[PDB]
């Protein structure tokens, strides 16, 4: 072979698309929880005051 | 009877109290409820308010206490004579409850129960309760003075 090939060399565009939507829907969904809990908790806290 | 002793030995735990149609009792107080048509209940964690629920059977839905939110300041009745209330804080005299009172309710002059009693803080010569209310829009919280010892 006159190349070089690399690590990422075979990851095609929709390859690279659906691991940016599986690392990006995870996420996203574990920031929605996160983000559920916190806001619960001030409402919580306006209940007593 | 709409308020049920707790015992885990023998001995008083806590109580128990029907209120709108529900069975209440702390999270603190271990034991079996006397009655056993509401002992047999599964209750519900509320670890937000150390408080289990459940469903009144339809064999004790008669016995079920009615609540309010309106409590204006003023005194009101408990199992150990009159409770006072002022400033958004519940007090009793030293001396007057202690372990094994907590769960009871708390009666405004009509009956109806305002708040159940988790615990306390002696001041000096009162004791002030650690209790579940409902605010003015009458959402369930939870009231406790820096320092209550669950009873």
């Not at chain 2, 202690?98 to 708040?115: E, F, Q, T, Y």
């Not at chain 2, 579940?132 to 010892?149: A, F, I, L, Y």
């Amino acid at each position: 072979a006159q190349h070089t090939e690399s690590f990422t060399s075979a990851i095609s565009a929709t390859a690279w698309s659906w691991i940016k939507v599986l690392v990006g829907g995870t996420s996203a969904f574990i920031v929605l929880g996160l983000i559920a809990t916190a806001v619960v908790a001030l409402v919580l806290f306006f209940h007593r005051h | 009877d709409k308020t049920f002793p707790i015992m885990l030995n023998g001995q008083v735990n806590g109580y128990a109290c029907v209120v709108g149609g529900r069975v209440f009792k702390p999270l603190h107080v271990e034991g079996r409820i006397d009655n056993e048509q509401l002992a047999a209940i599964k209750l519900k964690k509320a670890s937000i308010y150390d408080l289990e629920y459940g469903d009144v059977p339809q064999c004790m839905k008669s016995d079920t206490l009615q609540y309010t939110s309106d409590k204006p300041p003023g005194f009101y009745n408990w199992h150990h004579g009159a409770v006072q209330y002022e400033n958004n804080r519940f007090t009793v005299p030293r001396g007057v409850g202690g372990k094994g009172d907590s769960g009871r309710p708390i009666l405004d002059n009509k009956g109806r129960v305002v708040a159940i009693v988790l615990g306390g803080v002696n001041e000096g010569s009162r004791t002030a309760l650690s209790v579940v209310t409902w605010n003015q829009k009458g959402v369930t919280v939870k009231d406790t003075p820096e320092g209550s010892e669950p009873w």
